[PDB]
Design a protein around this ligand. Structure first.
Ligand code: HEM
Ligand SMILES: [Ca+2]
Ligand SMILES: [Ca+2]
Length: 329
């Protein structure tokens, strides 16, 4: 099919996404930047979608977190999420797609702004939300590895799939884990979708970037970086550690598996055959910036190797003394 301006798309229905793309790129993402609203929109895809259980209910990727915001945003596990919900609401009202579609579309468009990013498949036509998600379906950073894997598995994800989705933490920061240090990133490159998250979580924890003993927080290897207890434990767990390590300096695998697993997540509670493939609307992301490296001042001996079958790859360190990671704007 051909849109009004001559551009090809696989299905004529997708043409309506282009004005939405332009609007959100200019007015939500600060001119197609990989900034705070991109990170929060990506986070929102998960907090909407994971509200899905065969036993316990929930409509999955259905826009419920917007359509029933006063209910869902008050769940403890959704702390901090109301900013992005409130920011996206006007766009949904202004345009002609469902809240469920918009959440996934904004997430995909956002990721495409980030150097190293990947194009996530996007499908159009999610019905409006029918009911609020049940509470207690979103994993928390203080939940045990087994609890997290159980919940993600309940929603449909194998343990290796959870590792692949956690590539998102490569472009991520925390405001509520340690409120004394808002906007503290999970890796040294929160503006680049890269393997640094998987490297740096493997390093032995040395310190606290803010205060000690926050719930859901582990020791970080670097000033200016925060480590979730969940990520700490997943990098070291037999079920996930070898997959975790395999992401290190493997940009193609990170991209391939993130795109496929995000697509799966985006379709929780949905039937792909009842939707329209509009993947070709997502822009080409910028190329990777930077190479895979240990932080300056670190060596292989600082890695806590957790994959028995395969040794950690022989990365080199950035030159110079240990340095701190800048907070994110
Ligand atoms: C598997 C269990 C997971 C846990 C326990 C977890 C936990 C967290 C926590 C505690 C934060 C910081 C929130 C704050 O204090 O501000 C965070 C941020 C974030 N999460 Fe995860 N998460 C998980 C999986 C995921 C998944 C599957 C995605 C997929 C998109 C995701 C995307 C993000 C992003 C993009 C941020 C950064 C938000 C920002 O910088 O504004 N997370 N996560
Ligand atoms: Ca939902
Ligand atoms: Ca990164």
């Amino acid at each position: 099919a051909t849109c009004d301006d001559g551009r090809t798309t696989a299905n004529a229905a997708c043409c309506i996404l282009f004005p939405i793309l332009d609007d959100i790129q200019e007015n939500l993402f600060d001119g197609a930047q990989c900034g705070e609203k991109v990170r929060e929109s990506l986070r929102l895809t998960f907090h909407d979608a994971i509200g899905f259980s065969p036993t316990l209910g929930g409509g999955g990727a259905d826009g419920s977190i917007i359509a029933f915001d006063t209910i869902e945003t008050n769940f403890p596990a959704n702390a901090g999420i109301d900013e992005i919900v409130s920011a996206q609401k006007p766009f949904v009202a202004k345009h002609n797609i469902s809240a469920g579609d918009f959440i996934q579309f904004a997430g995909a468009v956002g990721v495409s702004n980030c150097p190293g990013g990947v194009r996530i498949p996007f499908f159009l036509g999610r019905p409006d939300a029918v009911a609020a998600s049940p509470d207690h379906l979103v994993p928390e950073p203080f939940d045990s590895v087994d609890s997290i894997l159980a919940r993600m598995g309940d929603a449909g994800f194998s343990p290796v799939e959870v590792v692949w989705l956690l590539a998102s933490h490569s472009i991520a920061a925390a405001d509520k884990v340690d409120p004394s240090i808002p906007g503290t990133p999970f890796d040294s490159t929160p503006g680049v979708f890269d393997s640094q998250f998987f490297i740096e979580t493997q390093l032995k924890g040395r310190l606290f970037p803010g205060t000690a003993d926050n719930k859901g927080e582990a020791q970080s290897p670097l000033q200016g970086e925060i480590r979730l207890q969940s990520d700490h434990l997943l990098a070291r767990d037999p079920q996930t550690a070898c997959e975790w390590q395999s992401m290190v300096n493997n940009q193609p695998k990170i991209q391939n598996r993130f795109a496929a697993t995000m697509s799966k997540m985006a379709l929780l509670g949905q039937d792909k055959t009842k939707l329209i493939d509009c993947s070709d609307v997502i822009p080409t992301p910028p190329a990777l910036v930077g190479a895979a490296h240990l932080p300056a001042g670190f060596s292989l001996s600082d890695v806590e190797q957790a994959c028995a079958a395969t040794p950690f790859p022989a990365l080199t360190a950035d030159p110079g003394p240990v340095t701190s990671v800048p907070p994110v704007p």
